[PDB]
Amino acid sequence: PNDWKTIRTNDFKNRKRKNEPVFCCEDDKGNYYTMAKYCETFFFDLKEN
RNA sequence: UUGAUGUCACGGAACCUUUGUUGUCUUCGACAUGGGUA
């Protein structure tokens, strides 16, 4: 995909437990892309003291 | 812009002295990546 925001989960590394999502993909050349990230980080409770 | 019976100024070489020098093998292997799980 051209947009990183449009990348969605396509598979699971451990299909038994429905965990560890993986987005398998391929490009024009002989390259295979495996992603093991599906959650970002949310910062909260900012401290000014 | 001179002064007058007296100007060798063609009477005088910008001349003389200082090294772009010194130092460097066109060489070559370990990663890259950030979480995910609970």
Name the closest residue (CA) to the C1' of nucleotide B35.
A37
Q: What 3 state SS string does chain A have?
A: CCCCCCCCCCEEEECCCCEEEECCEECCCCCEECCCCCCCCCCCCCCCC
- Name the method of structure determination: cryo-EM
Protein residues contacting strand B, judged by Cβ under 7 Å = A 17, 19-21, 36-41
Nucleotides of B under 7 A from a protein CB: 34-38
| Token digits of residue A19 | 């965990």
- Dist CA A39 CA A31 (whole Å): 24
- Resolution of the coordinates in A? 2.5
- Residue in the block written with tokens 């969605």: A8
| Token digits of residue A3 | 């947009």
Whose C1' is closest to the CA of A40: which nucleotide? B35
